Short mmCIF file of C-alpha atoms and ligand atoms in Angstrom, two decimals:
data_model
loop_
_atom_site.label_atom_id
_atom_site.label_comp_id
_atom_site.label_asym_id
_atom_site.label_seq_id
_atom_site.Cartn_x
_atom_site.Cartn_y
_atom_site.Cartn_z
CA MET R 1266 -16.31 -18.24 -84.46
CA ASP R 1267 -14.02 -20.82 -82.36
CA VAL R 1268 -12.26 -23.13 -84.79
CA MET R 1269 -10.86 -26.51 -83.06
CA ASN R 1270 -7.22 -26.52 -83.30
CA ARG R 1271 -7.26 -23.47 -85.67
CA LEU R 1272 -7.76 -26.06 -88.81
CA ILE R 1273 -10.46 -25.94 -91.32
CA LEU R 1274 -10.84 -28.99 -93.41
CA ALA R 1275 -11.40 -27.84 -97.55
CA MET R 1276 -13.45 -31.08 -98.25
CA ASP R 1277 -13.40 -30.79 -102.26
CA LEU R 1278 -13.61 -34.70 -102.95
CA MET R 1279 -16.43 -35.20 -105.29
CA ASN R 1280 -17.49 -38.56 -104.25
CA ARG R 1281 -20.13 -38.49 -100.96
CA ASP R 1282 -18.79 -42.04 -99.83
CA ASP R 1283 -15.08 -40.77 -99.93
CA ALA R 1284 -16.05 -37.38 -98.60
CA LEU R 1285 -17.79 -38.87 -95.65
CA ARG R 1286 -15.38 -41.30 -94.97
CA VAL R 1287 -12.20 -38.82 -94.93
CA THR R 1288 -14.36 -36.05 -92.94
CA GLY R 1289 -15.10 -38.79 -90.45
CA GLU R 1290 -11.51 -40.03 -90.32
CA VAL R 1291 -10.04 -36.45 -89.32
CA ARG R 1292 -13.20 -35.88 -87.09
CA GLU R 1293 -11.33 -35.96 -83.81
CA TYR R 1294 -8.96 -33.10 -85.00
CA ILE R 1295 -11.61 -30.65 -86.74
CA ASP R 1296 -15.12 -29.05 -86.05
CA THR R 1297 -15.34 -26.72 -88.87
CA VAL R 1298 -15.62 -28.03 -92.60
CA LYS R 1299 -15.36 -25.93 -95.86
CA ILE R 1300 -17.78 -27.23 -98.48
CA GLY R 1301 -17.29 -25.90 -101.94
CA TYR R 1302 -18.65 -26.40 -105.35
CA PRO R 1303 -16.59 -29.40 -106.16
CA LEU R 1304 -18.56 -31.66 -103.66
CA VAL R 1305 -22.08 -29.76 -103.68
CA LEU R 1306 -22.31 -29.83 -107.56
CA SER R 1307 -21.45 -33.52 -107.59
CA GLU R 1308 -23.51 -34.58 -104.49
CA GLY R 1309 -26.15 -32.06 -104.14
CA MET R 1310 -26.93 -29.25 -101.51
CA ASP R 1311 -28.49 -32.02 -99.11
CA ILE R 1312 -24.43 -33.16 -98.57
CA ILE R 1313 -24.35 -29.91 -96.01
CA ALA R 1314 -27.27 -31.37 -93.64
CA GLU R 1315 -25.75 -34.95 -93.83
CA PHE R 1316 -22.33 -33.29 -92.51
CA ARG R 1317 -24.49 -31.50 -89.76
CA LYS R 1318 -26.14 -34.89 -88.98
CA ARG R 1319 -22.99 -37.07 -88.87
CA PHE R 1320 -20.08 -34.79 -87.47
CA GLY R 1321 -22.07 -31.74 -85.98
CA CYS R 1322 -19.18 -29.77 -87.57
CA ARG R 1323 -19.75 -26.34 -88.64
CA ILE R 1324 -19.93 -25.48 -92.31
CA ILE R 1325 -18.79 -22.58 -94.49
CA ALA R 1326 -19.98 -22.73 -97.66
CA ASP R 1327 -17.12 -21.63 -100.05
CA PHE R 1328 -19.20 -20.09 -103.13
CA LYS R 1329 -17.16 -17.32 -103.99
CA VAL R 1330 -20.45 -15.61 -104.30
CA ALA R 1331 -19.50 -13.05 -107.63
CA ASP R 1332 -22.85 -11.88 -109.05
CA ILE R 1333 -25.22 -8.63 -108.81
CA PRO R 1334 -26.94 -7.88 -105.64
CA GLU R 1335 -30.46 -9.56 -106.56
CA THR R 1336 -28.82 -12.68 -107.83
CA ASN R 1337 -26.30 -13.00 -104.61
CA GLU R 1338 -29.18 -12.56 -102.35
CA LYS R 1339 -31.09 -15.66 -103.90
CA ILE R 1340 -27.69 -17.46 -103.66
CA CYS R 1341 -27.25 -17.07 -100.06
CA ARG R 1342 -30.98 -17.89 -99.37
CA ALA R 1343 -30.54 -20.84 -101.09
CA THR R 1344 -27.03 -21.69 -99.19
CA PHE R 1345 -28.54 -20.79 -95.53
CA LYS R 1346 -31.54 -22.98 -96.16
CA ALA R 1347 -29.62 -25.58 -96.87
CA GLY R 1348 -27.43 -25.28 -93.37
CA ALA R 1349 -24.62 -23.68 -93.77
CA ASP R 1350 -23.25 -21.54 -91.31
CA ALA R 1351 -21.25 -19.27 -93.11
CA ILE R 1352 -20.82 -18.46 -96.99
CA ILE R 1353 -17.71 -17.08 -98.74
CA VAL R 1354 -18.30 -13.86 -101.07
CA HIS R 1355 -15.83 -12.21 -103.63
CA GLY R 1356 -15.46 -8.66 -103.04
CA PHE R 1357 -14.15 -7.69 -106.45
CA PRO R 1358 -17.81 -7.09 -107.96
CA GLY R 1359 -18.18 -4.08 -105.51
CA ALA R 1360 -20.17 -3.18 -102.40
CA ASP R 1361 -23.51 -3.55 -103.29
CA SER R 1362 -22.97 -7.40 -104.30
CA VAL R 1363 -21.42 -7.57 -100.79
CA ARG R 1364 -24.11 -5.87 -98.78
CA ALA R 1365 -26.77 -8.17 -100.38
CA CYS R 1366 -25.12 -11.23 -98.84
CA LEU R 1367 -24.99 -9.42 -95.33
CA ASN R 1368 -28.57 -8.72 -95.72
CA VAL R 1369 -29.33 -12.51 -96.10
CA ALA R 1370 -26.86 -13.62 -93.33
CA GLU R 1371 -28.27 -11.18 -90.87
CA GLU R 1372 -31.96 -12.60 -91.48
CA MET R 1373 -30.84 -16.05 -91.09
CA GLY R 1374 -28.38 -15.86 -88.37
CA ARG R 1375 -25.34 -16.81 -90.20
CA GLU R 1376 -21.87 -15.30 -91.04
CA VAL R 1377 -20.14 -13.48 -94.52
CA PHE R 1378 -16.41 -14.06 -95.16
CA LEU R 1379 -15.04 -11.43 -97.41
CA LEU R 1380 -12.44 -12.84 -100.19
CA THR R 1381 -10.20 -10.08 -100.61
CA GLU R 1382 -6.83 -11.80 -102.45
CA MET R 1383 -6.58 -15.41 -103.79
CA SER R 1384 -3.59 -17.50 -103.39
CA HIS R 1385 -3.11 -18.52 -107.04
CA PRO R 1386 -0.78 -16.86 -109.52
CA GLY R 1387 -3.54 -15.72 -111.65
CA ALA R 1388 -4.52 -13.43 -108.53
CA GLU R 1389 -1.55 -10.95 -109.19
CA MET R 1390 -2.90 -9.89 -112.54
CA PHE R 1391 -6.12 -8.03 -110.94
CA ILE R 1392 -7.17 -9.10 -107.51
CA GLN R 1393 -3.87 -8.02 -105.63
CA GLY R 1394 -3.84 -4.48 -107.07
CA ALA R 1395 -7.66 -4.42 -105.70
CA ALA R 1396 -7.18 -6.09 -102.70
CA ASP R 1397 -6.14 -3.69 -100.02
CA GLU R 1398 -8.95 -1.59 -101.36
CA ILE R 1399 -11.46 -4.52 -101.01
CA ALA R 1400 -10.17 -4.89 -97.74
CA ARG R 1401 -11.34 -1.59 -96.84
CA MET R 1402 -14.60 -1.63 -98.12
CA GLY R 1403 -15.28 -4.63 -96.00
CA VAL R 1404 -14.40 -2.42 -93.11
CA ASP R 1405 -16.67 0.32 -94.39
CA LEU R 1406 -19.64 -2.35 -94.96
CA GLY R 1407 -19.21 -3.95 -91.12
CA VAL R 1408 -17.41 -7.06 -92.31
CA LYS R 1409 -16.11 -9.09 -89.57
CA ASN R 1410 -14.45 -12.45 -91.28
CA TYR R 1411 -12.16 -12.36 -94.22
CA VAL R 1412 -10.17 -14.68 -96.39
CA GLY R 1413 -6.56 -14.16 -97.57
CA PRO R 1414 -3.92 -15.95 -98.88
CA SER R 1415 -1.37 -18.12 -96.96
CA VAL R 1416 0.90 -18.24 -100.05
CA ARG R 1417 2.05 -14.56 -99.85
CA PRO R 1418 3.00 -13.78 -95.88
CA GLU R 1419 3.63 -10.25 -96.56
CA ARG R 1420 0.02 -9.58 -98.11
CA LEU R 1421 -1.60 -11.85 -95.56
CA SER R 1422 -0.27 -9.55 -93.10
CA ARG R 1423 -1.17 -6.53 -94.67
CA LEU R 1424 -4.71 -7.63 -94.79
CA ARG R 1425 -4.47 -8.28 -91.34
CA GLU R 1426 -3.19 -4.86 -90.68
CA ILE R 1427 -6.15 -3.24 -92.54
CA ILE R 1428 -8.64 -5.34 -90.79
CA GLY R 1429 -7.67 -5.24 -87.23
CA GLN R 1430 -6.59 -7.76 -84.60
CA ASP R 1431 -10.66 -8.12 -83.94
CA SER R 1432 -11.60 -9.18 -87.35
CA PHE R 1433 -11.51 -13.00 -88.15
CA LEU R 1434 -9.20 -13.99 -90.94
CA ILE R 1435 -9.19 -17.56 -92.32
CA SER R 1436 -6.31 -18.25 -95.03
CA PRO R 1437 -6.24 -21.11 -97.66
CA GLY R 1438 -2.97 -22.25 -99.59
CA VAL R 1439 -1.35 -24.06 -96.81
CA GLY R 1440 0.43 -27.45 -97.72
CA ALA R 1441 -0.28 -28.38 -101.27
CA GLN R 1442 0.08 -24.48 -102.48
CA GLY R 1443 3.20 -24.31 -100.57
CA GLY R 1444 1.73 -22.10 -97.62
CA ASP R 1445 3.44 -23.06 -94.33
CA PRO R 1446 1.00 -23.61 -91.42
CA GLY R 1447 2.77 -21.87 -88.52
CA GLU R 1448 4.03 -18.71 -90.68
CA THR R 1449 0.11 -18.39 -91.94
CA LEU R 1450 -1.18 -18.53 -88.26
CA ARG R 1451 1.10 -15.42 -87.33
CA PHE R 1452 -1.49 -13.57 -89.28
CA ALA R 1453 -4.68 -15.69 -89.92
CA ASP R 1454 -7.07 -17.15 -86.93
CA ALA R 1455 -7.34 -20.58 -88.60
CA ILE R 1456 -5.97 -22.34 -91.65
CA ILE R 1457 -7.70 -24.18 -94.54
CA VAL R 1458 -5.95 -26.92 -95.74
CA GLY R 1459 -7.58 -29.52 -98.65
CA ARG R 1460 -5.48 -31.90 -100.54
CA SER R 1461 -2.55 -31.81 -97.94
CA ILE R 1462 -5.37 -33.83 -95.67
CA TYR R 1463 -7.75 -35.41 -98.21
CA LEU R 1464 -5.27 -36.86 -100.92
CA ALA R 1465 -2.90 -38.10 -97.98
CA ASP R 1466 -2.51 -41.80 -97.76
CA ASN R 1467 -3.79 -41.77 -94.37
CA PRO R 1468 -5.80 -38.28 -93.64
CA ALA R 1469 -6.11 -38.68 -90.07
CA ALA R 1470 -2.05 -39.07 -89.39
CA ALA R 1471 -1.78 -35.95 -91.99
CA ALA R 1472 -4.02 -33.68 -89.91
CA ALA R 1473 -2.28 -34.76 -86.73
CA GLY R 1474 0.99 -34.04 -88.29
CA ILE R 1475 -0.03 -30.21 -89.30
CA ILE R 1476 -1.28 -29.74 -85.60
CA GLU R 1477 1.81 -31.24 -84.15
CA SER R 1478 3.65 -28.67 -86.24
CA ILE R 1479 1.62 -25.58 -84.64
CA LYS R 1480 0.94 -27.22 -81.23
CA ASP R 1481 2.76 -24.14 -79.52
CA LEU R 1482 0.26 -21.78 -81.44
CA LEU R 1483 -2.77 -24.06 -79.99
CA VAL V 973 -21.16 -20.18 -132.83
CA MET V 974 -24.09 -21.71 -130.92
CA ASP V 975 -27.43 -20.55 -133.08
CA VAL V 976 -29.98 -18.81 -130.38
CA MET V 977 -33.24 -18.64 -131.81
CA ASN V 978 -34.87 -15.26 -131.85
CA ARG V 979 -31.29 -13.86 -130.18
CA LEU V 980 -32.96 -14.22 -127.08
CA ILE V 981 -31.84 -16.12 -123.82
CA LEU V 982 -34.11 -16.84 -120.87
CA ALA V 983 -32.43 -16.19 -117.76
CA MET V 984 -34.31 -18.72 -115.33
CA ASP V 985 -33.60 -17.80 -111.89
CA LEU V 986 -37.13 -18.94 -110.43
CA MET V 987 -36.12 -21.17 -107.14
CA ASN V 988 -38.79 -23.86 -107.71
CA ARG V 989 -38.77 -26.48 -109.91
CA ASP V 990 -42.63 -26.39 -110.54
CA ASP V 991 -42.50 -22.77 -111.44
CA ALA V 992 -38.93 -22.85 -113.30
CA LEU V 993 -40.75 -25.69 -115.65
CA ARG V 994 -43.86 -23.82 -115.92
CA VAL V 995 -42.49 -20.72 -117.04
CA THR V 996 -39.87 -22.29 -119.24
CA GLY V 997 -42.31 -24.49 -121.07
CA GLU V 998 -44.83 -21.33 -121.67
CA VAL V 999 -41.75 -19.81 -123.95
CA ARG V 1000 -40.83 -22.78 -125.46
CA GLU V 1001 -41.70 -21.70 -128.72
CA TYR V 1002 -39.68 -18.27 -128.35
CA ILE V 1003 -36.30 -19.63 -127.07
CA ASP V 1004 -34.28 -22.64 -127.54
CA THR V 1005 -31.47 -21.55 -124.94
CA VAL V 1006 -31.71 -21.22 -121.52
CA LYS V 1007 -29.41 -19.89 -118.97
CA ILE V 1008 -29.24 -21.54 -115.65
CA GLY V 1009 -27.59 -20.13 -112.80
CA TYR V 1010 -27.29 -20.99 -108.90
CA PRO V 1011 -30.56 -19.82 -107.93
CA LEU V 1012 -32.25 -22.39 -109.32
CA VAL V 1013 -29.19 -25.13 -109.36
CA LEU V 1014 -28.44 -24.64 -105.55
CA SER V 1015 -32.61 -24.93 -105.01
CA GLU V 1016 -33.10 -28.09 -107.12
CA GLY V 1017 -29.90 -29.69 -107.56
CA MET V 1018 -27.91 -30.16 -110.64
CA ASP V 1019 -30.43 -32.68 -112.00
CA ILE V 1020 -32.60 -29.76 -113.06
CA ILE V 1021 -30.47 -29.51 -116.16
CA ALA V 1022 -31.17 -33.18 -117.19
CA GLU V 1023 -34.89 -32.19 -116.83
CA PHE V 1024 -34.96 -29.04 -118.81
CA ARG V 1025 -33.29 -31.24 -121.71
CA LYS V 1026 -35.91 -33.91 -121.21
CA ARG V 1027 -38.90 -31.62 -121.36
CA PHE V 1028 -37.65 -28.78 -123.61
CA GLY V 1029 -35.15 -28.48 -127.03
CA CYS V 1030 -33.16 -25.97 -125.30
CA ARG V 1031 -29.03 -25.74 -124.87
CA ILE V 1032 -27.94 -25.11 -121.34
CA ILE V 1033 -25.82 -22.24 -120.58
CA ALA V 1034 -24.60 -22.97 -116.85
CA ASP V 1035 -24.10 -19.21 -115.37
CA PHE V 1036 -21.99 -20.35 -112.59
CA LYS V 1037 -19.43 -17.22 -112.56
CA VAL V 1038 -16.77 -19.63 -112.14
CA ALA V 1039 -14.02 -17.68 -109.70
CA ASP V 1040 -11.88 -19.94 -107.99
CA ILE V 1041 -8.13 -21.16 -108.16
CA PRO V 1042 -7.28 -23.41 -111.24
CA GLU V 1043 -7.34 -26.37 -109.79
CA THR V 1044 -11.05 -25.96 -108.19
CA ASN V 1045 -12.35 -24.35 -111.37
CA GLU V 1046 -11.16 -27.52 -113.18
CA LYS V 1047 -13.54 -29.48 -110.57
CA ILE V 1048 -16.49 -27.26 -111.09
CA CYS V 1049 -16.43 -27.49 -115.07
CA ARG V 1050 -15.94 -31.05 -114.95
CA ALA V 1051 -19.19 -31.66 -112.57
CA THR V 1052 -20.94 -28.97 -114.64
CA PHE V 1053 -20.15 -30.86 -118.00
CA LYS V 1054 -20.74 -34.13 -116.82
CA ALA V 1055 -24.55 -32.94 -115.94
CA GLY V 1056 -25.07 -32.00 -119.24
CA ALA V 1057 -24.43 -28.11 -119.78
CA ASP V 1058 -23.37 -26.91 -123.06
CA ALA V 1059 -21.42 -24.36 -121.68
CA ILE V 1060 -20.30 -22.48 -118.52
CA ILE V 1061 -19.60 -18.67 -117.59
CA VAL V 1062 -16.64 -18.41 -116.03
CA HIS V 1063 -15.17 -14.55 -114.46
CA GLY V 1064 -12.01 -13.21 -116.02
CA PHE V 1065 -10.83 -11.10 -112.85
CA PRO V 1066 -9.25 -14.07 -111.10
CA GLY V 1067 -6.63 -13.90 -114.17
CA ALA V 1068 -5.66 -16.38 -116.87
CA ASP V 1069 -4.57 -19.18 -115.18
CA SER V 1070 -7.95 -19.50 -113.98
CA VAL V 1071 -9.46 -19.12 -117.15
CA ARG V 1072 -7.31 -21.51 -118.91
CA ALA V 1073 -8.33 -24.01 -116.53
CA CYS V 1074 -11.79 -23.58 -117.57
CA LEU V 1075 -10.62 -23.55 -121.23
CA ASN V 1076 -8.75 -26.89 -120.95
CA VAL V 1077 -11.61 -28.46 -119.66
CA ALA V 1078 -14.15 -27.53 -122.15
CA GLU V 1079 -11.74 -28.31 -124.80
CA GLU V 1080 -11.31 -32.08 -123.01
CA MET V 1081 -14.88 -32.61 -122.53
CA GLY V 1082 -16.18 -30.77 -126.15
CA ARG V 1083 -18.04 -27.96 -124.42
CA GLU V 1084 -17.97 -24.18 -124.35
CA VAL V 1085 -16.75 -21.45 -122.05
CA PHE V 1086 -17.71 -17.73 -122.01
CA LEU V 1087 -16.05 -15.29 -120.35
CA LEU V 1088 -17.69 -12.65 -118.11
CA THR V 1089 -15.49 -9.40 -118.82
CA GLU V 1090 -17.61 -6.75 -116.97
CA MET V 1091 -20.81 -6.59 -114.99
CA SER V 1092 -24.02 -4.63 -115.31
CA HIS V 1093 -24.56 -3.86 -111.95
CA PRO V 1094 -23.70 -0.55 -109.90
CA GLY V 1095 -20.91 -2.07 -107.98
CA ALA V 1096 -19.41 -3.20 -110.91
CA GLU V 1097 -17.75 0.14 -111.39
CA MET V 1098 -15.89 -0.11 -108.14
CA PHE V 1099 -12.96 -2.82 -109.35
CA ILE V 1100 -14.45 -4.40 -112.76
CA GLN V 1101 -15.06 -1.71 -114.92
CA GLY V 1102 -11.10 -0.54 -114.52
CA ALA V 1103 -10.03 -4.30 -115.64
CA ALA V 1104 -12.39 -4.77 -118.01
CA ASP V 1105 -10.62 -4.02 -121.19
CA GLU V 1106 -7.53 -5.95 -120.09
CA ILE V 1107 -9.74 -8.99 -119.01
CA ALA V 1108 -11.26 -8.94 -122.50
CA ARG V 1109 -7.82 -8.69 -124.10
CA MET V 1110 -6.95 -11.41 -122.15
CA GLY V 1111 -9.46 -13.75 -123.10
CA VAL V 1112 -8.65 -12.86 -126.81
CA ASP V 1113 -5.33 -13.97 -126.10
CA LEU V 1114 -6.23 -17.02 -124.50
CA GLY V 1115 -8.58 -17.90 -127.48
CA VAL V 1116 -11.77 -17.41 -125.79
CA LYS V 1117 -14.65 -17.21 -128.41
CA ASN V 1118 -17.53 -16.81 -126.03
CA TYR V 1119 -18.33 -13.53 -123.84
CA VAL V 1120 -20.65 -11.82 -121.79
CA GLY V 1121 -20.76 -8.05 -121.24
CA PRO V 1122 -23.24 -5.89 -119.84
CA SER V 1123 -25.98 -4.21 -121.80
CA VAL V 1124 -27.01 -1.38 -119.30
CA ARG V 1125 -23.88 0.70 -120.49
CA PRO V 1126 -23.85 0.66 -124.22
CA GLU V 1127 -20.54 2.46 -124.72
CA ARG V 1128 -18.66 -0.48 -122.53
CA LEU V 1129 -20.41 -3.02 -124.75
CA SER V 1130 -19.68 -1.50 -127.84
CA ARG V 1131 -15.75 -1.57 -126.60
CA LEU V 1132 -16.12 -4.96 -125.54
CA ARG V 1133 -17.37 -5.93 -128.99
CA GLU V 1134 -14.25 -3.93 -130.51
CA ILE V 1135 -11.76 -6.04 -128.47
CA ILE V 1136 -13.21 -9.25 -129.55
CA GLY V 1137 -13.75 -8.54 -132.86
CA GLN V 1138 -16.97 -9.46 -135.06
CA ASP V 1139 -16.32 -13.32 -134.90
CA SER V 1140 -16.41 -13.43 -131.53
CA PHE V 1141 -19.84 -14.70 -129.75
CA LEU V 1142 -21.44 -12.00 -127.21
CA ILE V 1143 -24.40 -12.27 -125.12
CA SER V 1144 -25.46 -9.57 -122.93
CA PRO V 1145 -27.81 -9.60 -119.68
CA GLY V 1146 -29.36 -6.48 -118.23
CA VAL V 1147 -32.20 -6.07 -120.55
CA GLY V 1148 -35.70 -5.02 -119.23
CA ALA V 1149 -35.60 -5.12 -115.29
CA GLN V 1150 -32.02 -3.32 -115.05
CA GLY V 1151 -32.92 -0.95 -117.88
CA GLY V 1152 -30.99 -2.12 -121.10
CA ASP V 1153 -32.71 -2.06 -124.22
CA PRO V 1154 -33.08 -5.11 -126.48
CA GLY V 1155 -32.82 -3.12 -129.63
CA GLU V 1156 -29.84 -1.19 -128.70
CA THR V 1157 -28.05 -3.96 -127.05
CA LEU V 1158 -28.36 -5.98 -130.12
CA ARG V 1159 -26.17 -3.63 -131.95
CA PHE V 1160 -23.25 -5.03 -130.36
CA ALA V 1161 -24.52 -8.39 -128.50
CA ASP V 1162 -25.55 -11.52 -130.54
CA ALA V 1163 -28.05 -12.25 -128.23
CA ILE V 1164 -29.63 -10.63 -125.35
CA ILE V 1165 -30.21 -12.43 -121.76
CA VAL V 1166 -33.55 -11.51 -119.98
CA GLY V 1167 -34.85 -12.94 -116.71
CA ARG V 1168 -37.47 -11.32 -114.54
CA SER V 1169 -39.24 -9.27 -117.18
CA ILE V 1170 -40.27 -12.66 -118.53
CA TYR V 1171 -40.41 -14.72 -115.79
CA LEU V 1172 -42.09 -12.59 -113.15
CA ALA V 1173 -44.49 -11.42 -116.03
CA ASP V 1174 -48.43 -12.73 -115.52
CA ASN V 1175 -47.79 -14.10 -118.92
CA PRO V 1176 -44.35 -15.07 -119.85
CA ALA V 1177 -45.05 -15.96 -123.21
CA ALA V 1178 -46.60 -12.75 -124.31
CA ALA V 1179 -43.74 -11.10 -122.33
CA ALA V 1180 -41.20 -13.09 -124.48
CA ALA V 1181 -43.24 -12.49 -127.94
CA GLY V 1182 -43.36 -8.49 -126.92
CA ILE V 1183 -39.61 -8.43 -126.63
CA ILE V 1184 -39.42 -10.17 -129.89
CA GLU V 1185 -41.58 -7.92 -131.79
CA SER V 1186 -39.56 -4.86 -130.81
CA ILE V 1187 -36.28 -6.16 -132.67
CA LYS V 1188 -38.18 -7.86 -135.42
CA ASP V 1189 -36.06 -6.13 -137.91
CA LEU V 1190 -33.26 -7.29 -136.49
O1 BMP P 126 -7.21 -17.66 -102.49
C1 BMP P 126 -7.90 -18.85 -102.24
C2 BMP P 126 -9.05 -18.98 -102.06
C3 BMP P 126 -9.74 -20.21 -101.72
O2 BMP P 126 -11.07 -20.42 -101.27
N1 BMP P 126 -9.21 -21.28 -101.85
C4 BMP P 126 -9.48 -22.72 -101.92
O3 BMP P 126 -8.90 -23.11 -100.59
C5 BMP P 126 -8.90 -24.74 -100.86
C6 BMP P 126 -7.29 -25.13 -100.92
O4 BMP P 126 -7.50 -26.33 -101.05
P1 BMP P 126 -5.91 -27.09 -100.88
O5 BMP P 126 -5.27 -26.97 -99.82
O6 BMP P 126 -6.17 -28.40 -101.66
O7 BMP P 126 -4.86 -26.20 -101.86
C7 BMP P 126 -9.56 -25.02 -102.28
O8 BMP P 126 -11.24 -25.55 -101.85
C8 BMP P 126 -9.66 -23.65 -102.99
O9 BMP P 126 -10.75 -23.38 -103.71
C9 BMP P 126 -7.70 -21.28 -102.53
O10 BMP P 126 -7.57 -22.15 -102.64
N2 BMP P 126 -7.39 -20.06 -102.47
O1 BMP P 127 -23.15 -8.60 -115.06
C1 BMP P 127 -24.19 -9.36 -115.32
C2 BMP P 127 -23.83 -11.03 -115.51
C3 BMP P 127 -24.87 -11.64 -115.48
O2 BMP P 127 -24.70 -12.82 -115.30
N1 BMP P 127 -26.23 -11.15 -114.82
C4 BMP P 127 -27.18 -12.34 -114.63
O3 BMP P 127 -28.14 -12.05 -115.63
C5 BMP P 127 -29.57 -12.08 -115.24
C6 BMP P 127 -30.11 -11.03 -115.24
O4 BMP P 127 -31.49 -11.20 -114.94
P1 BMP P 127 -32.77 -10.07 -114.81
O5 BMP P 127 -33.09 -9.92 -116.48
O6 BMP P 127 -33.79 -10.57 -114.28
O7 BMP P 127 -32.12 -8.68 -114.56
C7 BMP P 127 -29.21 -12.95 -113.94
O8 BMP P 127 -29.23 -14.44 -113.86
C8 BMP P 127 -27.95 -12.32 -113.26
O9 BMP P 127 -27.27 -13.01 -112.35
C9 BMP P 127 -26.49 -10.06 -114.76
O10 BMP P 127 -27.45 -9.73 -114.34
N2 BMP P 127 -25.22 -9.03 -114.92
#
């Protein structure tokens, strides 16, 4: 996956007008948008097709899929019907639940991203101790795309070690949560950035600034 | 605690509005509580909650297995309650802050959180099972009053009931299609969740009535 400027916009605004305006304001800087439940549950799954119509961007559905295999299959089918290019799945519920998502993605020409460790403080309680094993599970299942946390670079580096240089790794927690763009790109292929851009007085300048700070990594 | 008619909750995971409405209507006299998940919501929009409330006298539990960072969890809960859900189901494995985020919105908005502690599918053994007792205890410490645990492992369901105490409210999926027994499950759960063995039956009403007959003395 070729992400323009190694920068993925986390569009978690919950108003259609604001979401479209802000994404429009930064369109010259990005070609990949992560759309999550805050936007989808507020404005409907049709918003995905609308982003494609307006921007032509690729769309990653950040739905943190975490159900039993049967339900996971349904969630992925509905998500890919709506035009998502990729979906993010939790690894914690185990291998069968991930495989269900891989099946639908293969069937519809889409990608699965495996979330292995998360960026918030609570991730330390249960997820962190399972994270390396979840990553190895991804490798065993043939997962090629992964998500890991900007805020703990030593953990992000370990995740990269496990999955190898061939795998694709994207990383949230940059900006608002304290992650540094450049340090993160030592290990991740692309950074995910939400509030630092979409709550900025000037989203375009915010995006340009981040890109400026990593220009030697582009 | 919520007063669930016949101790039976319909898991409405059909993905077509016409079918979902038809089946739910057919079992209306047996069930006043409906669990709506992402298969239906991602297919038909959050307005499906409004339509169920309009058409039926049913409480709605939004089975969204909320599993994000605290900030995103808050947004998901707000959107879900705004749409008319009485309650939302949240994963415990992302840790205490992520759960507390949901509890805080639920308190502010006058609605309820259910904490999913262990799951019913084979993959749950890999990571979730080993964390389940601690996730449950964390729920108790956080003041969670409503819980979800698996019918298919009676010993595990029993332990979960022990941890949360008799006053807590506990609902349990995996009955029917996944092999869980209604009667045995209600030894520990307040209510059973049933999907396919009702909604895929030639006569969903007869299917519901049959389950209810089997647990009449309970
Ligand atoms: O570990 C993770 C995984 C995520 O998907 N995310 C998501 O990435 C985005 C972070 O946005 P922000 O830059 O505003 O912190 C949010 O959409 C959040 O749900 C995260 O923050 N941490
Ligand atoms: O551990 C769990 C937790 C669930 O929410 N569920 C949910 O409960 C329902 C089970 O439906 P069914 O009776 O068709 O197996 C589905 O909506 C599934 O997503 C589950 O099966 N196991």
